[PDB]
Every structure is written in C-alpha cells, then in structure tokens.
Amino acid sequence: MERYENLFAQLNDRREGAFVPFVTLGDPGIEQSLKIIDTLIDAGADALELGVPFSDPLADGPTIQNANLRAFAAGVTPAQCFEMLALIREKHPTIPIGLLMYANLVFNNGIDAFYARCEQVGVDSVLVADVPVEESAPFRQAALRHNIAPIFICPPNADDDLLRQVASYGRGYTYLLSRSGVTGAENRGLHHLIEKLKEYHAAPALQGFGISSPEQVSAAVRAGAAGAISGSAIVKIIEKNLASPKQMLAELRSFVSAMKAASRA
Amino acid sequence: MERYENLFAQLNDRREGAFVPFVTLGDPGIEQSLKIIDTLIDAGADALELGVPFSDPLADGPTIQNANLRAFAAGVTPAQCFEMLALIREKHPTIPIGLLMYANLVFNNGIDAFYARCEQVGVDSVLVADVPVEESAPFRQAALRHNIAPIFICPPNADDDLLRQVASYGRGYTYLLSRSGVTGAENRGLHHLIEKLKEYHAAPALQGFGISSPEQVSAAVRAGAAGAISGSAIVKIIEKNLASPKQMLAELRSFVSAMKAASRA
Amino acid sequence: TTLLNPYFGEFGGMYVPQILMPALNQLEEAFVSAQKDPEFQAQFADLLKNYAGRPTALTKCQNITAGTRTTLYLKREDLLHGGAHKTNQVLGQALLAKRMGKSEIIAETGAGQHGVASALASALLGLKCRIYMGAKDVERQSPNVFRMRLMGAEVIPVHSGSATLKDACNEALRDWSGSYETAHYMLGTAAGPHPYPTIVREFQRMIGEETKAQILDKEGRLPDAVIACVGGGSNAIGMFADFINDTSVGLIGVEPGGHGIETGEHGAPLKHGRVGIYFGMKAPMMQTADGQIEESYSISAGLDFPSVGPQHAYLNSIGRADYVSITDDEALEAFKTLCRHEGIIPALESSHALAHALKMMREQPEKEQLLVVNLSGRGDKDIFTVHDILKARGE
Amino acid sequence: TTLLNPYFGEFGGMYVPQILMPALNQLEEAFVSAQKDPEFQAQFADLLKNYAGRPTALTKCQNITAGTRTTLYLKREDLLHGGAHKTNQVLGQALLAKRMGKSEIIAETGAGQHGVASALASALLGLKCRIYMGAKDVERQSPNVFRMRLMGAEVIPVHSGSATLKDACNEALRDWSGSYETAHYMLGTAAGPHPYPTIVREFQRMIGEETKAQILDKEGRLPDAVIACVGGGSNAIGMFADFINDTSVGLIGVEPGGHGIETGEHGAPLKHGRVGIYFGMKAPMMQTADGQIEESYSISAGLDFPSVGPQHAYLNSIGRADYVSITDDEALEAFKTLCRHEGIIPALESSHALAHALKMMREQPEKEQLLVVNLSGRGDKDIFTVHDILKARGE
Numbered sequence A, B: 001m002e003r004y005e006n007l008f009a010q011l012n013d014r015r016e017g018a019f020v021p022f023v024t025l026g027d028p029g030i031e032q033s034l035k036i037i038d039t040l041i042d043a044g045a046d047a048l049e050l051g052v053p054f055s056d057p058l059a060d061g062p063t064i065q066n067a068n069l070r071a072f073a074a075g076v077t078p079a080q081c082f083e084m085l086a087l088i089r090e091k092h093p094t095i096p097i098g099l100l101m102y103a104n105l106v107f108n109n110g111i112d113a114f115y116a117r118c119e120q121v122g123v124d125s126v127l128v129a130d131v132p133v134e135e136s137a138p139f140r141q142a143a144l145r146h147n148i149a150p151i152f153i154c155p156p157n158a159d160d161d162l163l164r165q166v167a168s169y170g171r172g173y174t175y176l177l178s179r180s181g182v183t184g185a186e187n188r189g190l191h192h193l194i195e196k197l198k199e200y201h202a203a204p205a206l207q208g209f210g211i212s213s214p215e216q217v218s219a220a221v222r223a224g225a226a227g228a229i230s231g232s233a234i235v236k237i238i239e240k241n242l243a244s245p246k247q248m249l250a251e252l253r254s255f256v257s258a259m260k261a262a263s264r265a
Numbered sequence C, D: 001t002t003l004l005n006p007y008f009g010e011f012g013g014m015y016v017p018q019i020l021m022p023a024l025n026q027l028e029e030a031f032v033s034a035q036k037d038p039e040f041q042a043q044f045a046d047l048l049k050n051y052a053g054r055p056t057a058l059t060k061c062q063n064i065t066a067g068t069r070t071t072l073y074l075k076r077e078d079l080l081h082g083g084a085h086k087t088n089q090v091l092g093q094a095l096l097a098k099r100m101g102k103s104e105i106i107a108e109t110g111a112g113q114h115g116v117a118s119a120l121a122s123a124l125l126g127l128k129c130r131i132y133m134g135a136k137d138v139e140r141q142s143p144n145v146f147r148m149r150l151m152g153a154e155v156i157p158v159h160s161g162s163a164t165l166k167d168a169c170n171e172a173l174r175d176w177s178g179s180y181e182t183a184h185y186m187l188g189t190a191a192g193p194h195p196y197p198t199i200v201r202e203f204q205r206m207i208g209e210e211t212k213a214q215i216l217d218k219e220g221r222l223p224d225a226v227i228a229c230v231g232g233g234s235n236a237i238g239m240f241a242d243f244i245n246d247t248s249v250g251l252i253g254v255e256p257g258g259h260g261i262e263t264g265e266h267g268a269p270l271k272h273g274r275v276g277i278y279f280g281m282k283a284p285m286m287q288t289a290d291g292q293i294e295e296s297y298s299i300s301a302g303l304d305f306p307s308v309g310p311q312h313a314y315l316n317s318i319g320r321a322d323y324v325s326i327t328d329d330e331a332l333e334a335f336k337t338l339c340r341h342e343g344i345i346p347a348l349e350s351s352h353a354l355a356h357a358l359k360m361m362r363e364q365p366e367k368e369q370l371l372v373v374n375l376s377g378r379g380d381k382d383i384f385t386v387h388d389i390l391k392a393r394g395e
Ligand SMILES: O=P(O)(O)OCCNS(=O)(=O)c1ccc(OC(F)(F)F)cc1
Pocket: A022, A049, A050, A051, A059, A060, A064, A100, A127, A128, A129, A130, A153, A177, A182, A183, A184, A185, A208, A209, A210, A211, A212, A229, A230, A231, A232, A233, C017, C018, C019
C-alpha cells in the first residue's frame, strides 16, 4: 500500500508534522494494550510505532525494557502480536503502522515468512533495530516483495555513503536519530542531515529518541523533519498508572493531544 | 654435692629402683605446688624432676603443656621457681633435685649465672631438653663449674658415638628415653642400651616418657635401669582435682606410693 | 564495507544498531594497522613476556593417565598474570584503545577473569574501567569482584534477565552505544560483531603457537588432539588457530552440559541450539520456538552463555573441529581429580575440557593418544563454590 | 658432627631434642648427595620449569616511580604456581623426602602459601601431607585453607599460644619428634635447626640468580639494591644469595613493624629483639626479660613470627645486609598503590618490601637508584582481609 505516502502528503497540505507514539504490543496486557492504542489514535496520533516483545532488546533503555517485561508477564507472544495488529488495522484502515523489531524475531522462522505475515495483517513498515544497512539485503528484499517499507536509521554520525544508502534502500520514512545511546525519555537529544536526505530524495524524516515534550516536537518540525516519535514518555504513563487503567488512558490522551498540537505549524 | 651418687648407692643396697615424679613448679599455684611436692616426697619419691614454666615447651605433650599454662596463670616466673627450690631444699636436705629446662631459660641472662643460681638453691642436676650433646659444651662446662650434674639423653635410636658421649659428658643419672615423641601418659614406650651404658661407666639410667603405671616401673627395674620417671601421670592427677586440693594430695599420695612400691625388688 | 571478512561461512557479521558501525569500522582499521606495526607488536610482546609471564608452561600429567596409553599435557594459562588466558587479548585491546585515543574501557565478565584482566590492564595503561557483571556471578565468583575493585575498576551488578554473562553482555553493549566516543568496548570473548571474533583470535593465538613449539620440543610430533572449553570461544580459538592447517590435529571444543542436555539447563548452543541473530552476530543460540533468546545454565559462570563465537560454528559446520559437552558433575570430578593427583586447582571452566580428555582416556584406555588440554584458568575463584557443593554431598 | 657448617657466625645450630639429631644428620647427608647428583638437579629443574613456571618475570614498574629518579623492578614470584615463592623449595624438599624413603610430609604454615605448596607437591609426587596452621591464620588466610584441603592435605588448626605461625611451628616439630621415621618435616622458611636454613637458601637461590640475569639483560648493570620482606627469611635469602659477593649491591630486608615498634606489637626481632634459643636455632627473638618467647604481631600472617633465620642475623651483624621495618599501615598503602597503578595484587607480606622501596623513592626522589623488590607472592589470600579494613575506613 501507500499509507505513509498518503499521510505525509496530507500533513504537507495541512502544514503539519507527524506525531508518532511508540508502545509495546501487549503492555500491560492484550486488552489494555488495544485500548491504549485506540486512545493514542483518538488523541491525534498520525502513525504508530509498535514493539513486539523481545527477550533482549539491545537498543532500549530501562523504561521500554520494562514494557517488554510486562508484556511477557502477560504471556504475550509474537503470534498474539500479529493477532493484535490485524484487529488494529480492521478498526483503522489508513493509519500507518510500523513495527519495531529485533533481528532474531524476523530471522527466526524465515525472513520472507515474517514480512509475508506483516503484509497479511496490514503492517506498513518494519524497522529492524540491530540490522544496519550493511547487513540489510535479505531484509529489505523480503520487505519490498511483500509491500512493506523497510526503515533505516540516519544517526548523527552519518557520513555521505550512509546517507545515500539510507535514501536509496529505505521506504515510508527515514529514522532520524536524535542522539547516540538507547531509548529513554531521561536522555534528551541536525539540519545538515535533514537537508542532505531531502537532496537524495529519501523518505520523509521522523526524529526519534529522547523526545518527551511538545517543545521538542515543535523544534523537530521547525528543523525540517516531517515529524517526531516518542516512546519512553508514553510508556512511563502506562507504567505509572498500572493500578488505574482509567487514569492511564486519560493521561495518555492528554499527553498525546499536547504532543500532536505542537506538531501543527 | 653427691646427692645422686648417695641415692643410687643406698638404693643399690636396698635392692631398689628409684621412682622419680615430675611436676611443673608453681602448678596450680606456688603454695599448692609446694604442698604437692612435700606430698610426693612423703609418699616415697626417691628424687624429683621439676619443670620451670616455659612459654613454648617443645618436648612436652598437652598434659604438661597445660601444667605450664596453669603456672603462668598463677603468675609463676623463673625467679619464683628458684625461691621455691630454696624452700624445698631447706626442708629436704638429701633428696636429689633435677630441673627440666628449655635452653632459652638457661641461656637468657647468661649460662654461667643460671648454673650458679642452681648451685645457690641446692639443685643437683639440670636437663636442658633442646640441647643435644653436639651443642652442649658451654652448658656442661658451666654445670660442672658450679657442681651441677648435666643430664643427657640416650634415645632408642642412639648409636655408639652418642652412647660414649653421653657416658662421658653426663653426671648424676642418664636419661633413658622410652620412645620417640613428646611427654605423655597416653603414649606408652632396651637392654642393649642399658648394658652399653654400664660398659662405658655412664651415670645410672632412669627410664622416662610414657611411664604411668607400677607395672612399667617394675619392668624398667627388671630391665636393669636404676629407676623410672613419671610426669604426665602425676600431672593428670593435679589437673583432675583442681577444685579439690585435699583429694588432689590424697590421690597423689596413693599413686606415688604404688609406683614406689613397684620399684622394690 | 570492511577490510576483513566479517563472516565465517554463514556465521558472524555486524548485527548492531547503525549508530555503532563507525566504531566497529574504526576498531577494524586500528587493528589492521597495528598488526603490521612493528612497534605495536613489540609493545604487545613486551607486556606479554615481562608483565603477564609468557610463555606459559606446558605440563605433562604424571599421575592421572597412569595405566592408560594416553599422554596428557596441560597448557598452563592458569599461570598467566590474573589467573586466566583472558589477560592475553586484554593487553592487546588496551593497546588498541590507546592507539585510538580512548580513555575509558567497558567490559563484560562472567567468571570475573576478563573483568580482572580489563581492570589490571586499565590500571597499568592509564584507562578508566567499568565492568558489567551479572548479579548471580557477583556472588558465585566473588573473589574476582574484590580483585577488580581493589584495582580501581567500577563493578556494576546486572540484575536483568538471568543475571549472568549474557545480561552483562547486553548492558555493556547498551552502554557502548552511548559512550563509544570516549570508551572502548573491550569484549572478552571470540564473539559479538566483527571485528571482535577476529581480533580476539589473533590476540589469543600465541596459546596454540606456544603449545605447538612446546609439544614439538618434548614429543617430536604434533598432538593427536587439542581440547578446550567453549563459552564464547576465546581460549579455544586461541589454542586452535595455529593448528587449523595441521589436518592431523583434532580440535575438540567442550561446551557446558549443565544439569544435562535433556534438562534444557545447559550452555551448549553450538550443538543443541539453532542459528539466530543476537549480540551483534549470526550464530547458534539457545532460543525458544518463537525466537526469544533462552537463558543458559552452567555451574561455571564463564561458560554460562547461550551462544558461541561464529568461527567455532563455522569450524564445526565444515567438520574441522568437533564439539562435545560435559555436565556439571563431570566437570566437578575433573576439578577434584586434578587437585588431588596433579596439585593444580583448575577453573571450573577449564575443568570441562579436562573432563572430556579424561573421558577420551577412560573410555579407550589402550588407545595411543597424545592430548593437550588448554588449562584456561586457575580455580581460586571457584574454591568456595566447589567446597559448598562438596559439603552437601558429605565429603 | 656435620658435613656443613651449622652456624652463621654466632647464629644457627641444631638446638633440638636429642631424638631428632639423626633425622637432621640424615637430611643433611641427603641434601649434600643430591646437590652433586645430576639426575636430582635435572628432576628439580624440570619441575621448576614445566610445573611451577620458572623463570618468573622481572617487571619494570611503569607508573609508581613517575617523577622520581628511581627505576623499580618487581621479581614476579607471585606468578609461580601456587602463588608464592614457597613453591620453589617445597619441590626440592619433596624430592629429598622421596630420596630418603619418606611417605608423609609435615609442614607448618602462616599465610598458607607454604601449606598450599606442600599440599600441591605432595599431590604431584605421591606423599601424604598434614599441615599445621594457627587458628587465627585459618581465619585471616582462609582461601588457602580451602585450597589445601581441595588438594587432599590434612589441615590442623592450632589454638595454643598466639594461634599463629610460631604455634604452627611448635606443633609441627612436636609431631616430627614422634613421626620422623616415616614423615619428612618440610620446614617452610630459612630458619629452624641446621640443615634447614642452608637447604632452604639453596632451593630458593634461583630467585636471585634469575634476577641478576634479567637485570643485566635489561639494564646492563647490577641493581643498587634488592629488597625483600623477612619473616623466617626464605624469600629474602633466596633473592640475596647470588648477590652476597657483589659488594656494590645493597641487600635490604624488611621485617613487619605491626602497629609500630614502640607498641611492642610487631614481628621485628632481628632489629628489636635479642639473641635466644628456640625452634632449633640460636637467633634474635622477641622475648620477655625472663626469657619467655614473646608473641609477635603483623597484619600479615606470613610475617607474624617472633624470630628470624640465622643467616639474616649474621649478614646483619657483619653489615652486609641492612634490615628495616614497615608498619601495617605502610604495607596497606603499598598494597593499594600496586593494585591501582600497576594492576598487580601483591601479598601483604610482599607489600612490606614494596612499601620500603616506595619510601626509598619518596624520601629522596632525585636520588638515582635501580631497585628490585622481591614480589614474593600474590594477594588473593588477602583480599577479604584488606577489604574489611578498607571498609572500617570508609573507602
Ligand atoms: O522516546 P524514546 O527515547 O523511548 O525512543 C523511542 C524509540 N522507539 S522506536 O520504535 O522508534 C525505536 C527506533 C529505533 C531503535 O533502535 C535503533 F535505532 F537502533 F534502530 C529502537 C527503538
């Protein structure tokens, strides 16, 4: 499909950046996770980034580490995640859905089969966090074969060759890393990269890592990014309100609405 | 003097071996030690072997180790021992008195001065336990200078050269070791040695180490030894009756009388 | 793009977040440059000789092969400064770190021997060292925690996951992904992303080089087999490397069988896992049907790891090396036997290799065979663990 | 009558009960015969090289002498199998025991390194080993108790006296006086009755021989001084011996100052005791006015001894060697400094020698001097003791 392409064209018209929340599928349970995701969308999420729980998430800090642990405590499996994704797409036909994957979950029982499953449930993109462009050939080939956008990372230490590869190999959006390190709202994190990506006709850039406030969202848009991703800030609201599922959704709605408002220029 | 010479001549006439108890001077206190020694003599002791408490008595097993410790707990010093010896000799003019010494106590403030002190209080012999004949020259010289008999050891592993040296260098009596090891009643321990000593005109032999019963005393006499020494067996009676000073002396008297009776042939 | 091949057949690669690729390429370039730099090689050789104590002895067993036709030598890496083979390649990587202008060191450790090595090299060469160690290992290898801290290293207990080596590896890599500008990640085994499996092999290969020279001097021939325990794979590849082209020499790697392969509580992914992608590499791993990484188990902290270095997976696949497993109880018996009959207290890791050699001898006692066991470390770190076990058994 | 001189000037001799003189004469004869037996020398050399790991490194300090004109080398006996120099002469005495037809070994131990050495040699060479150790030392050197027992040695705690090394010595000698027919007393220091001070020196003298060769190779000259801690005296006489006729080379022995010489709680009889007769020898000892032997004290179990070997008393008397003392706190600072700045964890015994070298440097930092410290052992046995202290101080 063309869900990212359609989204960015609409946002372009409305003079808007995208706001894209991340959560872990099945955190803190399947049913509450589905409600959380519906709340994110109703509150103004332009797209979703959704993590499949993985035993050893090496690009994630403690907040999202503990999200993965909560989902596992609820018995969440990749199979159950794909059932969730199907339900989400059934409810929401146009919102772009991207998965955050670790390589072994994609590789496990066949790379091609993984991307085929993504296509079946209506996923639009897959970001494999521990597969650099250098190792990406079978992943991006399988992705394109099944109409999935493979997402690649433009780090702050990116050189020209990486920029050209990311622009060529990637579809849907380009991930603009705010900083080195791992995910975390505690650690807050470039025009030359944004400009070069546009020169090489890369997919629109979403800034991610350490974005936890509306001011950072506004600033990313001002910089020329097409939008911003926030994960740990969202997940902290879940963690804080485990015993209060009703307040959890209210506070999620308030936060997402505020972040989305800041994307509007 | 000639106290050993006079004793053995008298015993020879009476067809008797000597019975010679050992105790530690000042065990369990000065006053009780003096009473113990008077009891030993009244009960039939022919001679005395008396230990001066030493911090590290390497030829002694646990029983006499603990006798030394008891005397130290009573604050007994070599100076106090010499005061005791003077009192003992004052009471008992003819009984031979031998000291069991460790080398450092003799060497400490002058070998010559030590033997001079022995002479002053009326000691007849000194056995330095950790000075073999090979190292004995300044000890036996000082001993003879002050009319003290230096005692030497004939071990069961004695060769001819040792026998000849012991016979020549020693006075008073020859110590016939029953066995290897250290003092102890728990460990019970030779005619060829007794005969060779007599051939070389050595001082009369007293058997010692592990002698704790009248049968062993009789057997030593039968073998041709001039007598027997018993230490740990005596000291055990002291140790057993610390809270009962009256029974202590009664049991000491009974035991010494029985051991002495067995020396009679 | 790389200067050297990141793969051993299908296995290996550089499966790290994109952020870390320049750090890995920099390290590779630095290594290739150092390997042809006579001054680097001289500095490394001088440290190995005059600081670490190389060459290490090759000891002929005098008693444990009695009545058999096995001749058994022990390569005595237990005599190396620090008490294990880990010290060799740490000295090389620390010199690389200095060469690259890094002032800090990150390391993971399980048995604490790599941690001790990282700490001592950092103290010597003026680097600030922090060490991740699983909380379970902090307890069962406690003497090395004390040693690391006395040498001024920061020791950070890891409570996540199994609280053992894989979890220390995770945290070390997470740390590096944010601190690579000033910290060198001194990976302690022949695993992880390229170039580490290659660098670690090349900085350990003096083990096998010395062994070859020593066995030729003493026996006038090559061994029938060399035998080494395999966690991540560094002491084994260090022993194996110089013998790979000597086709008559058997290469036998010994993974931990734990409570028994059938219990699932082991650390033997090479032979009982399946290929996956984790810790920067494509390699055999213990994993669930779903592709979650399984927790391993071994009585030995140093072997308690659910994957294995890619060069071992490759050497296995082509049949050049053979891999076996040894249980906790087999390793404990080998430990006791070496203590009592040769007067050497071996690391419990190394005891797995010895246990397999003892099996080779006992199963076929009239087979003529000349064997070398890599005695990768001494057992001081293990004596409290082993004693506690040999008390719940009477003994 | 003896084959060799039992005295060093006034000091030494054979002050044992008469029962033990044949055992000592037998041992002397066996030693003299072995010393000219090419097969004995070859067997001893082979064990030292291929089992124990000789020669040991000579390490130049890279950091702790910065800003001074001191060049400091460490003779790395900490790298010897077992972890201390004690292993050298135990291998020689064990071969002597076999030569004499003995099947059992008695040993005393304080730091437990001689105990570990006696146990490992007995396991290797097929001897039954029992070790006396003071109960206080069983506690503060506990890792070595575990090591001894794992190698099949019987460890017997001694509760009499100070429950430290002198009390272990007492019990070992008491035992031998009854068991000499079948047991060899493997005395662990250069003290006791002749021939032990001589035998122990000759079986340790490779320390100084190697040091001389190594320093000539690296510096082209002899050291200005060699520095070693002194308990009974074996590592120091082992370092000193080959330099005694090199009159330009200072010989500096370091006794434990404990809490301070003025407190009376120390182990420095050579310089602060007076001559006495005890443990089979005429030697300086800590003693009361009355001639009772005083209890010593040191933070280091291996130096906690109230006498000293007679050859050291002699070398002192003629001015060939100089003896000094170092307190607990000075030794602790040297321990910390070596750990943090050279990455070597030294025995607390050895730390006394290092502390004095550090004083020589710090007091006169523009004095040109080439120094060697005998690093007689590694500090693994001490790490729990040192940590507990460095917690009651904050740190
Ligand atoms: O707000 P934060 O700091 O929690 O960041 C949330 C990011 N969540 S995510 O799915 O986009 C994401 C994207 C990339 C990641 O790793 C990689 F860069 F190496 F690929 C990890 C997570």
